[PDB]
């Protein structure tokens, strides 16, 4: 975010400002995060309550995403949520019962389950069958 | 699982009486300088 009012820095909407910041604007695209969270949160696994999303901002900010949240599908409104979240450090529900989006203290490990398998997506790494790995992985553990 | 909408403001501002009080403090600080 940056005061112009605070606006989520965007790859296309803002170009000169990020140049003044000196940051390569190629890596200034939050829409990827918006779509990924959109495809994630709308997945049936969330509807089954078996998923939690964590967002690690490039600056080093860790955000916990409650499975109940619903981001706006429109990107413009999504930016409004992010600037609201980053400055207030928390987002409250319309009914005011739970904090859907909360910034949390690093490292990530403490929040993760005690027994959990960690993996990353690597294009150079061996190509696997996602289904097969999940069955051979143990039950009590998490991925 | 339950679904609840997130609450937020369209534009974030980081009522009038506080604004009046805020202007007073700025005026206090300047007038003190002019006197000194």
């Amino acid at each position: 975010t940056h005061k112009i009012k605070y606006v989520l820095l965007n790859c296309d909407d803002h170009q000169g400002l990020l140049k003044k910041m000196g940051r390569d604007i190629s890596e200034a695209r939050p829409d990827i995060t918006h779509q990924c969270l959109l495809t994630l949160l709308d997945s049936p696994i969330n509807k089954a309550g078996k998923l939690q999303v964590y967002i690690q901002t490039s600056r080093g900010i860790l955000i916990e995403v409650n499975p109940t949240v619903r981001i706006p599908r429109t990107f413009k409104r999504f930016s409004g949520l992010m600037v609201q979240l980053l400055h207030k450090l928390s987002i409250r529900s319309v009914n005011s019962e739970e904090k859907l989006l909360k910034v949390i203290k690093n490292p990530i490990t403490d929040h993760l389950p005690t027994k959990c398998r960690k993996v990353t997506l690597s294009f150079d790494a061996p190509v696997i069958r996602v289904q097969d790995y999940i069955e051979k992985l143990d039950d009590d553990e998490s991925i | 699982i339950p679904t609840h909408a997130p609450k937020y403001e369209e534009n974030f501002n980081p009522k009038m009486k506080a604004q009046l009080k805020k202007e007073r403090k700025f005026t206090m600080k300047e007038i003190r300088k002019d006197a000194k």
Binding site: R70, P72, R73, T74, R77 | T3, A5, P6
Partner: peptide, 11 residues
């Protein structure tokens, strides 16, 4: 109850 591809209300 919102469902599917609904967007949150805009006021």
């Amino acid at each position: 109850r919102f469902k599917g591809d609904d967007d949150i209300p805009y006021k």
